[PDB]
């Protein structure tokens, strides 16, 4: 409950379908929630097994 | 000692909280030295985190944010090196670890062995339920002990005080959970840290965090380099200066520096410089191989075009080849670094105003012969069916690996064949080629022939079914050997039987037939000297490349050799009706008819 | 610190015992670091040796072997390094110091501060009247003291015991001058040496003898490099390895290693290699200079000759050029080391069965252009009146010196002139040329022009009187300038007031006369294109070396030059001997611009 | 004196007019006295001054 949705001007931050959030803190911070296939700070890399 | 590569994704996470917990286990379970960063985010309450107790050293920063668990079990963590910092300021960052809509959150930090942070500062903030983290004398732990230096230490009131044996400064509610001071308690004569208040209980300069004695072999963590148990500023070099003879004399105990350790020899794929093992040599010098050892020496007036890869040098801030940096690779032949193709590089990145790459710009890579790092391809233009833009690549050096991999190809449906052509060696690391659902020829290649050690393996999992590729006729040229191939052509095989004519394989080289004459040996064919006459009726024309290696020549004979016109220039000569040249008398260079002055002009 | 240099006489001496004492004063008076051997031989019991109290450090051996004095005044000598050892065995050897016919001899050793001996053994023997030496705890003083490393004390006569407060370990009768221990009394938690038995009173591992405190900047002496007051095993280099990036980065704290010290700059004639300054570069690399700093880098297909001098490299056991080693210089343009010509080399050495040098063998040095050390000539064949064997020498490097000298010529009697041609620079050290009673031309040389600094000087005395040399006609060629000269020939002057050709100064050049023709330049004249016309009556045609420069040529004229034959489009000569293009299809021969002008 | 003269078989051990002597101690040791114009262990070098 510490996060809000990125504004439309920021929603292009996260790349491969990940949902963009902003932290409610001051100097604000961004993060995004990746689909199971993707990782990295902007969801730009694939997740690997074996 | 068990080593793991850690992560570099800051506050981002998987949307599925069960997969985020499983990923945390897969990265950090059963390892002691964390390279990269240790970062724990969005973990649920009542999860088992006891596997984190194996961690003793973190190279980058430690980040703990937005979690719901009660206790942080890093009980064996001793040192954070701080080679990278969170926000470029903090080596240890702990924040927002509670639910504001209930009563879950982080209460106690299992950090009682942490006694050294070598770079950056500490950030412990906005954690509602922490009890003891606010009592800690953090200036004993950091190498920059000032309240203004990149440091903030904030939790709620009402939690019980420290145990009666301790002057505050505790990690927990009871005995055996107190802070151990090793810098603020030392005698004024002592350098670094100590294990007692007396000058007799002070430790060696090079030891980090804490110690058991004054020796360089009897402490918990090491600064600079570790010389087989001894903690040192640098290791013994190849030469030692003699203070009375004024010369450099050869050493008997010399060791090569290799990261934080010293070794008797460098790895086979590294280059040696000034008694150390380095990933690449400076642009003013060539790398050369002498007696099987790679070394670096000054270049001649015209020398090879060394070029920066992704993540090093002029491209240190880049994560992928893209439409902005692709112009910097135009005349490159050797890339010092990685070559990486991510979705953002190929299909564009509107957030940073970067356009998608024009598929024709990728042709700048057709001149590259060696990549010193790894090749990582996760996106490729949808209309390109192969990697023929790399047909001149010969070696992948593997001096930097992607979690142990040196060649990585993921999830590309537009590819039907690989089509590498010049590739002969992959010097280090594993190969991973998966999910490429239209790709056939991967299953024919004898992949162990490209390796330089028995430790290398290839991962094939979910590419196009080999039996279906066989049913469609997706197989190589009849002439190629059991070593396999890169694509359907006669010039795309790893090796072939009979003979080759440059890169193209052939059954025979027409030694006594056709429009050309050439000589053959060792499965290779090479053109004969064009002045030699072509032989017919089954007779072989040339035994080698020389004019003395063929049955006859249209040019004049001059000893074993053949010559256009021996009367031209020169000493002087005539030639006979059998087209053999012979000497004339001196002072006949104007013209002569025989071995005399009497027929000269 | 005041630095002197040690002798290499061992037991030998001058036949006048007062000259032996006067020499001992001149070598060891008013210095504290010896940089060589300290050796006291045949000094009488009445002579004052109190000047030796300034000595604090010896880098070679200490030898006290035939003297008649009562007290050895070295009480502030702290450390002996043992770089060279007496008999290859001992760093401190004291023996035979008594008069057999009476009661005179060495009784007490003034060695209260001698605390560290880093190499070799200790020998005290046959000093009949010596009082306390068997009470010295030599296994605390000597590093690695066990019997196989030769630590031994025998004096034979009885003597009274020292004060009880020193528990039987003494230098003299008093408690003020007895044994101090800094190695065998220290607590087991500390290595090296200490200033008290307690762990808190032990010192840094990289310091020698003893200390005032626990710091590497607060100790008495050390066995490692002095980095601006700190004793350290190695000092900061030009590059440091980055353990995270696996690359070498440049170090803003870098220092050069030079002898026993770490320095910011090195001497102008030393080569810089691997963050250190050395006397010579290894044979695998070529010596170069950039930004005024000498360095060396891997050499190409042709490299400088690996030819060594006397006392270095393959010739370290040699002290002269002689008949057993002179053949090594046959093909040698640069000699790495000294050239030393002693009486035992030129005239042979019967004790070692070495034959004299045949004067014709000295011709192997005619190829030499550079000497990296010093040139020291004390003997030369009686039949030779000059040094023309070295006429091609260009410079003396002076990277090593003989008593501060880089050129030394003593007492030659058959010499009349020097006869050098190529020598321009003497890069370090002084010049000493004396007693050459028949040498004349020395007074005609501007010796200051050969030096690289005002701190270099020349000493001359007792050579042939200049007024006699002039009266006898032993003077230089009339063309010579004020820079000076060293022989009667037109090639023997350093610089001249007119033109030159090759090595010879000349009155006039072949400008308007001669079978070849030259153009003028600043201090030399040089031939022009051989095709250029050899015109009479002062009508000079050479004004530069180029085929384009000549005002009239005897061969066929073209735009950029003249040629003996013009190109085969064919170009044909006109009545003024200039060549012009023929018809475009004609190549074989021609006399005009169109198709019917083509000739076969 | 602890010194005695060298036997004829050791002639030319010391050069340039120097006189060879032996130390009376056991191996034996060798030295020479020489004129003021020579020095070094065998008196092979000139004495240099002013
Ligand atoms: C906080 O960090 C400290 C410091 O790193 C840790 O303290 C130590 O814990 C380790 C184990 O995790 C201890 O190591 C083991 O010690 C045994 C006893 O050693 C005695 O001898 C040494 C000699 O130097 C003394 O220093 C010591 O005081 C003891 O008197 C050894 O027997 C063990 O080695 C044997 O077992 C292993 C098993 O794998 C074999 O591989 C070996 O070959 C050998 O047979 C081992 O060395 C260490 O001694 C402890 N140090 C101190 C100072 O107490 C803490 O664990 C760490 N975390 C927490 C939460 O406290
Ligand atoms: C300076 O560098 C030296 C190396 O040059 C480092 O030495 C390391 O010391 C650590 C201990 O401090 C060693 O780690 C421990 O080794 C135990 C023994 O394993 C070795 O020996 C067996 C012999 O049969 C081999 O099979 C095995 O492959 C290893 O070679 C292990 O038993 C220990 O692991 C156990 O405990 C942990 C929990 O504590 C569990 O997670 C494990 O599953 C297991 O039960 C542990 O691995 C290490 O091996 C040493 N390395 C080397 C190369 O010798 C110094 O630490 C370093 N100093 C500093 C300050 O950095
Ligand atoms: C006309 O056609 C003939 C062949 O029909 C050609 O002849 C061959 O030419 C190759 C070079 O192209 C020769 O190879 C070289 O041979 C040298 C001599 O050694 C061989 O011969 C002696 C004879 O006593 C044997 O004892 C010995 O075992 C060898 O069989 C070697 O010295 C060469 O390599 C070695 O030396 C070099 C030195 O630089 C090193 O770099 C190498 O590493 C290696 O140590 C090399 O092997 C071959 O010998 C020739 N064969 C014959 C039959 O003569 C003609 O050249 C061709 N004419 C023209 C103009 O092309
Ligand atoms: C045997 O070896 C010992 C030890 O090395 C020698 O003792 C040294 O003696 C010299 C000369 O007296 C000392 O140097 C002087 O140190 C003064 C600083 O104070 C010292 O003493 C106090 C306690 O009294 C200590 O706390 C402090 O750490 C120092 O150790 C300076 O003020 C002096 O400078 C003045 O004199 C010099 C003289 O050249 C002038 O140039 C200056 O301008 C100035 O006027 C001086 O530096 C040295 O410190 C002593 N060392 C120790 C450890 O005591 C013995 O000399 C030697 N034996 C014999 C027989 O000589
Ligand atoms: C590591 O390297 C450093 C730097 O070279 C050495 O430091 C030297 O210290 C010695 C003493 O231990 C000095 O020698 C003595 O210096 C006196 C003069 O000092 C003044 O001038 C200097 C600048 O020139 C100032 O820095 C200093 O503070 C003083 O103001 C002389 O008076 C001494 O000579 C007199 O006394 C002796 C006693 O035997 C007599 O024989 C002499 O005839 C004379 O009367 C003496 O020369 C030396 O100057 C220091 N050098 C420098 C450059 O500072 C360290 O010693 C060296 N090793 C170690 C272990 O640290
Ligand atoms: C017979 O031979 C004599 C010589 O004996 C010839 O003399 C020539 O004199 C001219 C001047 O009158 C010289 O030309 C000048 O040379 C200078 C040096 O150039 C060299 O060094 C620089 C270093 O950076 C290099 O860049 C350059 O490539 C050369 O290697 C130049 O600085 C001069 O440039 C200036 O003047 C010209 C004039 O046209 C301007 O265009 C430029 O912008 C600039 O301002 C100039 O080039 C020449 O070098 C002399 N030659 C020789 C061989 O010494 C006689 O000319 C000749 N007579 C006949 C009949 O041919
Ligand atoms: C010092 O350096 C010299 C090179 O500068 C070393 O080599 C000697 O150089 C001289 C001068 O060039 C040579 O003399 C010439 O020889 C040729 C004939 O050479 C050919 O025939 C011989 C037959 O034996 C053969 O060995 C050669 O390889 C050639 O095929 C004459 O035509 C000339 O007129 C002139 O006489 C020497 O031959 C040469 N010697 C050697 C051994 O190569 C010289 O050896 C160096 N000295 C020392 C002591 O190191
Ligand atoms: C892929 O290429 C590799 C490398 O060329 C091939 O491996 C080779 O396999 C052969 C046959 O098994 C080995 O030969 C045997 O060697 C032993 C050595 O003791 C000998 O006793 C036998 O008589 C026989 O000669 C050969 O050593 C081996 N090479 C290597 C480097 O391992 C492999 O067969 C290829 N695979 C395909 C798909 O053809
Ligand atoms: C006939 O046989 C000759 C050899 O007798 C073949 O030529 C040789 O080809 C090999 C490569 O297959 C060359 O070796 C390589 O040379 C490079 C030089 O930079 C080096 O980097 C490699 O490590 C390796 O040593 C070899 O030099 C070459 N020999 C000659 C004499 O040129 C030839 O291909 C065969 N076939 C025909 C028809 O010529
Ligand atoms: C020997 O070599 C020295 C050093 O190169 C020569 O000394 C030089 O003398 C000239 C001429 O006196 C000095 O140049 C100028 O001289 C005029 C007076 O003639 C004076 O007004 C100027 O102020 C200037 O000094 C030159 O600076 C001087 N060089 C040095 C380094 O002192 C000397 O001439 C040579 N020959 C003889 C015979 O001494
Ligand atoms: C006419 O005389 C002048 C001198 O008055 C000559 O000029 C000189 O040319 C030489 C050619 O070798 C220059 O030498 C240089 O030596 C350095 C050594 O490191 C080398 O790196 C350079 O490449 C160059 O060879 C010298 O500097 C130069 N002197 C002056 C004052 O400019 C000229 O060559 C004479 N012409 C004839 C026809 O002899
Ligand atoms: C040059 O050496 C020769 C010997 O090779 C010397 O000439 C001899 O000198 C003695 C002197 O007593 C005469 O008796 C001989 O008659 C001389 N021989 C000849 C053949 O002339 C000559 O003295 C030497 N010169 C120098 C300057 O040392
Ligand atoms: C095999 O290829 C056929 C082509 O029609 C395709 O329909 C089928 O899905 C493929 N199956 C597998 C397992 O590759
Ligand atoms: C030097 O010359 C004078 C005549 O000017 C002469 O008397 C004298 O003897 C000569 N000296 C020597 C040593 O020859």
Author numbering:
A (entry chain C), D (entry chain D): 177 to 202, 205 to 228
B (entry chain A): 26 to 179, 182 to 597, 604 to 634
C (entry chain B): 26 to 179, 182 to 595, 604 to 635
Sentences from the paper on this structure:
Human Epidermal growth factor Receptor 4 (HER4 or ERBB4) carries out essential functions in the development and maintenance of the cardiovascular and nervous systems. Important cardiovascular functions of HER4 are exerted via heterodimerization with its close homolog and orphan receptor, HER2.
To test this hypothesis for HER4 complexes, we determined the cryo-EM structures of full-length HER4 homodimers bound to NRG1β or BTC. In both structures, HER4 kinase domains were bound to afatinib to enable high-resolution reconstruction in the ECD module (3.4 Å for NRG1β, and 3.7 Å for BTC). As observed in a previous HER4/NRG1β crystal structure of isolated ECDs, liganded HER4 assembles into homodimers with near-perfect C2 symmetry. The two receptors in the HER4/NRG1β dimer adopt an angle of 37 degrees compared to 33 degrees for HER4/BTC. Detailed 3D classification analysis revealed substantial scissor-like movements around the dimerization arm in both data sets with the concerted intermonomer movement of domains I and IV, varying from 35 to 39 degrees for HER4/NRG1β and 30–35 degrees for HER4/BTC. While both pockets bury a similar surface area (NRG1β: 2967–3068 A2, BTC: 3142–3163 A2), the HER4/NRG1β pocket is characterized by a larger network of ionic interactions. In the HER4/NRG1β pocket, HER4 K438, K35, E112 and D376 form salt bridges with NRG1β E215, D219, R207 and R220, respectively. Most remarkably, at lower contour levels, our HER4 maps show continuous cryo-EM density connecting the two receptor monomers originating from N548 and N576 on domain IV of one receptor monomer and N358 on domain III of the other receptor involving sugar moieties beyond the core glycan trees of 4–5 sugars. Indeed, 3D classification of the particles in our final reconstruction uncovered at least one class with more defined N548-N576-N358 glycan networks in the dimer interface. Thus, our analysis of the HER4/NRG1β homodimer cryo-EM density uncovers an important role of receptor glycosylation in stabilizing the active HER4 monomer by bridging its two distal domains, domain II and IV and domains I and II, and likely both monomers within the HER4 homodimer through direct inter-receptor connections.
